Design a protein around this ligand. Structure first.
Ligand SMILES: *[C@@H]1O[C@H](CO)[C@@H](O)[C@H](O)[C@H]1NC(C)=O
Ligand SMILES: *[C@@H]1O[C@H](CO)[C@@H](O)[C@H](O)[C@H]1NC(C)=O
Ligand SMILES: *[C@@H]1O[C@H](CO)[C@@H](O)[C@H](O)[C@H]1NC(C)=O
Lengths: 8, 100, 290, 276
């Protein structure tokens, strides 16, 4: 399952 | 900027046996950045019918790619892989040594 | 196969400015010809081949158009490539600027929506909304006519960082669609969250007498680089750099001067090099004036 | 016994050569099972292994949503990195993300990973407790300060312990016959004369899964680990792997050297001797 991603 | 030149391996999927079908592989790895041009050659001519794996990388972040095509080896048909990268001034040609 | 057409530094260019079209094909910005889409299959400029780039400077209204390029392909059946991706050159500064305002406001919770309305007493056929700095073509809407004003509602959302920034909008009359108005006054759109809220306090405190001056202090345990103070309903927006205090709390002290009257205030934390994403709002604080 | 799931994603800027490109790929052990290509026509997470082709549309709908979200987040991240490093908008740059998990054959969590690189060197990484970040330079500590204020580690730790190790368990069951099989390496040896006093013994391992394998040469029973040449394990193309190791031997001393092959598919390690 593909994760959440967050901004730098 | 980090720039790694590709390691080149060209080889057959199965033990090469002349007149019987096989796949010719060219495995480029350990390079950065990711933009790269790989060609498989039969007697120095760019072979059509070439597929490649999806771009991935190893734990050191360097990329790797498999380029492959279906071929039938013969006694003096001579195969090679031609690779170009930002770290190479001219394309690098590694020949397929059947008998390595 | 097919070249990549690009405009530098942007396809939305003011009249008198400069823009450069480059047609990257076969690992080079090699020689190419250009095609506007009214004449798809014969090149503009009577077949002119461009050596490197096409620098249009200064930009005129004649440069406005929808372009495709073909790159030179010597060892090929026909001497040239397939058409490239299209690029629309939009020349601004040809009409009076319209108005741009956000509904309900320019501060948008993450994941929510906001309406950007452009209107004008000039009767435009199309309105264009454009965020500054991005090379995606501006969004076009048809201008609705209502009691002598042309207007259009742009829906922005659900809110993400890639959508925050400075927006301007433009108008075009019916027969020069690539000739755009002067840009409206810019409108900053800010996404709030999900960074933890700062705390907002007043010194001496929230009740002040008329003529007396109070200061508001924003504070957080998280290392915000700036703080933004917003009066509710007002356009009174300021920003102050955060300061590390004696514990590692980060703080900024906003003075308000002599209190003519006071409203409610909220404060947001923002980080360095990312000015359009703020923290969640502080708890509201009402300043009463006697 | 142990098993792992990993997602590798690459975002590349290329000003004047194309729009930013995002490629993501999913692996269970040494077997790829999904891919996403921002420049492909599909615009969807695609199956790349037979055992996951049978997930429901809601699976593909949901994975596509979050991988497209990732592909758009990391393309804004390229723009932010230019500001962090005061870099020209004209150069091309790379952003890499690695994420995944390990489980033992007991079935539950051993380790999770969530790390980033910028232009091929470490940027930020979630450390082993899944509660804090390691920032490689001053730019990544801005990202760390942001991610602390947003309570990101808490969310990624929950995903890791939950959705991720239990998706891994489902994949291991759905494809255990291919993922939990072990094909042993077929072996042989070649002999090449370098010189009048010099010879190259090469030992081959072909057709094995998984990719982990040990090739050791021994002369009269102790290792020559700095004298043997080892090549990188390469994919055969059919899901198996190949590798070889080579010694440079004084001519007439082939008798001395033995090659030793260990692999999970082998009941016992192989020790192989050369003859003309
Ligand atoms: C530009 O031309 C292409 C075809 O050449 C067309 O598909 C596209 O819609 C045009 N763009 C505008 C803004 O008219
Ligand atoms: C556009 O947005 C405004 C403000 O939210 C609203 O009053 C109006 O009904 C919307 N629609 C039109 C067609 O103006
Ligand atoms: C930390 O110290 C500062 C001194 O500048 C003080 O204003 C603040 O109240 C302290 N932190 C808390 C949580 O009170």
């Amino acid at each position: 399952r593909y994760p959440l991603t967050f901004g730098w | 900027m980090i720039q790694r030149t590709p390691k080149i391996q060209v080889y057959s999927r199965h033990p090469a046996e002349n007149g019987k079908s096989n796949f010719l592989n060219c495995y480029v790895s350990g390079f950065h950045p990711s933009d790269i041009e790989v060609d498989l050659l039969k007697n120095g001519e760019r072979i059509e019918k070439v597929e490649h794996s999806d771009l991935s990388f190893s734990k050191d972040w360097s990329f790797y790619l498999l380029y492959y095509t279906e071929f039938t080896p013969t006694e003096k048909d001579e195969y090679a892989c031609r690779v170009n990268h930002v770290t190479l001034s001219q394309p690098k040609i590694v020949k397929w040594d059947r008998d390595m | 196969d097919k070249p990549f057409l690009s405009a530098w530094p942007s396809a939305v260019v003011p009249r008198g400015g400069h823009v450069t079209l480059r047609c990257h094909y076969r690992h080079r910005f090699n020689n190419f010809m250009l095609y506007k889409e009214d004449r798809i299959h014969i090149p503009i400029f009577h077949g002119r081949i461009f050596q490197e780039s096409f620098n249009m400077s200064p930009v005129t209204t004649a440069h406005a158009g929808n372009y495709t390029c073909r790159g030179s392909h010597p060892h090929s059946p026909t001497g040239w490539s397939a058409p490239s991706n299209p690029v629309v050159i939009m020349v601004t500064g040809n009409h009076r600027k319209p108005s741009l305002l956000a509904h309900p406001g320019p501060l948008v919770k993450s994941g929510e929506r906001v309406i950007l309305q452009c209107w004008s007493d000039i009767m435009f056929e199309h309105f264009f909304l454009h965020k500054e700095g991005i090379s995606k073509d501006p969004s076009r809407l048809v201008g609705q006519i209502h009691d002598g004003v042309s207007k259009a509602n742009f829906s922005i959302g659900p809110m993400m960082l890639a959508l925050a920034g400075t927006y301007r909008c433009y108008g075009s009359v019916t027969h020069t669609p690539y000739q755009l108005s002067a840009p409206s006054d810019p409108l900053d759109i800010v996404v709030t969250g999900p960074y933890e809220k700062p705390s907002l306090s007043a010194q001496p405190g929230p009740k002040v007498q008329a003529g007396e001056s109070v200061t508001l202090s924003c504070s957080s345990r998280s290392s915000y680089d700036m703080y933004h103070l917003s009066r509710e309903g007002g356009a009174h927006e300021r920003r102050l750099p955060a300061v590390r205090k004696v514990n590692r709390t980060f703080q900024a002290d906003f003075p308000l001067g002599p209190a003519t009257h006071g409203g409610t205030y909220r404060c947001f934390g923002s980080f360095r090099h990312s000015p359009y994403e703020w923290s969640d709002p502080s708890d509201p604080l009402l300043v009463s004036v006697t | 016994g142990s098993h792992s799931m990993r997602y590798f994603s690459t975002s590349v800027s290329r000003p004047g050569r194309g729009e930013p490109r995002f490629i993501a790929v999913g692996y269970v052990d040494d077997t790829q099972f999904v891919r996403f290509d921002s420049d492909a026509a599909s615009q969807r997470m695609e199956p790349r292994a037979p055992w996951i082709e049978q997930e429901g549309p809601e699976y593909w709908d949901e994975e596509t949503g979050k991988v497209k979200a990732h592909s758009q987040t990391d393309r804004e991240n390229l723009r932010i990195a230019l500001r962090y490093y005061n870099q020209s908008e004209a150069g091309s740059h790379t952003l890499q993300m690695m994420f995944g998990c390990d489980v033992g054959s007991d079935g539950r969590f051993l380790r999770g990973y969530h790390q980033y690189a910028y232009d091929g060197k470490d940027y930020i990484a979630l450390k082993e407790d899944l509660r804090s970040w390691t920032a490689a330079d001053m730019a990544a500590q801005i990202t760390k300060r942001k991610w602390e204020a947003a309570h990101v580690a808490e969310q990624q730790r929950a995903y890791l312990e939950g959705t991720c190790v239990d998706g891994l368990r489902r994949y291991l069951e759905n494809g255990k016959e291919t993922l939990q099989r072990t094909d042993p390496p077929k072996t042989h040896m070649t002999h090449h004369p370098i010189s009048d006093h010099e010879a190259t013994l090469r030992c081959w391992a072909l057709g094995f899964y998984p990719a982990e394998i040990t090739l050791t040469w021994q002369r009269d029973g102790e290792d020559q680990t700095q004298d043997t040449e080892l090549v990188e394990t390469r994919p055969a193309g059919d899901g198996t792997f190949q590798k070889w190791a080579a010694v440079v031997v004084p001519s007439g001393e082939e008798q001395r050297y033995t090659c030793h092959v260990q692999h999970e598919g082998l009941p016992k390690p192989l020790t192989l001797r050369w003859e003309p």
